[PDB]
Design a binder for this molecule. Sequence first.
Ligand code: HEC
Ligand code: HEC
Ligand SMILES: O=S([O-])[O-]
Length: 230
Amino acid sequence: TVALTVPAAALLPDGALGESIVRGRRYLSDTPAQLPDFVGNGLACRHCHPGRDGEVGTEANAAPFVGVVGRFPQYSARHGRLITLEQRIGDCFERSLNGRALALDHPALIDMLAYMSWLSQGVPVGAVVAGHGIPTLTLEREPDGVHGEALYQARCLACHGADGSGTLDADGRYLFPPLWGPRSFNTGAGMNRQATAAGFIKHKMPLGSLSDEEAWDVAGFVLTHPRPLF
Ligand code: HEC
Ligand code: HEC
Ligand SMILES: O=S([O-])[O-]
């Protein structure tokens, strides 16, 4: 693998590419408000792909976009063939954002690509960046949703809500995003899979850690709830 490095925002180039990169960051950070025609829930890309200092997709084990461009095209079992990064992003809009894929030459999509390419500067094509993806956590037993409910109340509810519906900020964006219900990800999302949710939670939640057993059980509890159908 190669190291995860985040480029300097002050070294962004003047011109069309620099302006596209800045728009891309905003589409990834503020997706429901910037692309209402394509987003069907309350999630922005940054809610599962967090980053520091206003960037999106720069955190190890939270599916960083640093280096993603050099890993496409790649096989998708979902599609039964090779897909491009443009297509992968469309799947995210359809599933994680319960919405509609952008056209493959949509300027907003190209801006998102430009941003991911910027984050990927210096990464050799084909190389795997340390911390890529969301590593799964799988235990050798069923998740205990009763334990998970107790853990949720003690460790998660203060942010994500008794009803899992999250906490809105003053501008109507989610400060703490919804984990289930009509504004959360739909059943087709990767985050709807037990080992993925458990892995994400293990590595990233609560914000600011859980034992494997705790992450496994609270993920199980989260995933007992209704959410939009894909
Ligand atoms: C208690 C262990 C939990 C569980 C099970 C989850 N969280 Fe959080 N969460 C918070 C914020 C700001 C985000 C956005 C991403 C980020 O900036 O890091 C998240 C994201 C999630 C997700 C993914 C998004 C989704 O809507 O599904 C999941 C599955 C998730 N969390 C589960 C903020 C907080 C907190 C405020 C300080 C606390 C506490 C937690 N989260 C605790 C948990
Ligand atoms: C949680 C509900 C998510 C939201 C909202 C978005 N994404 Fe996502 N994404 C998520 C998971 C669990 C994964 C799998 C990570 C892995 O281990 O492979 C992804 C993956 C991507 C990828 C591929 C990353 C790779 O390394 O191959 C891309 C390019 C991606 N996601 C883009 C993306 C965009 C643009 C989003 C807003 C429209 C978005 N994702 C939201 C979970 C979630
Ligand atoms: O493509 S993901 O949202 O399952």
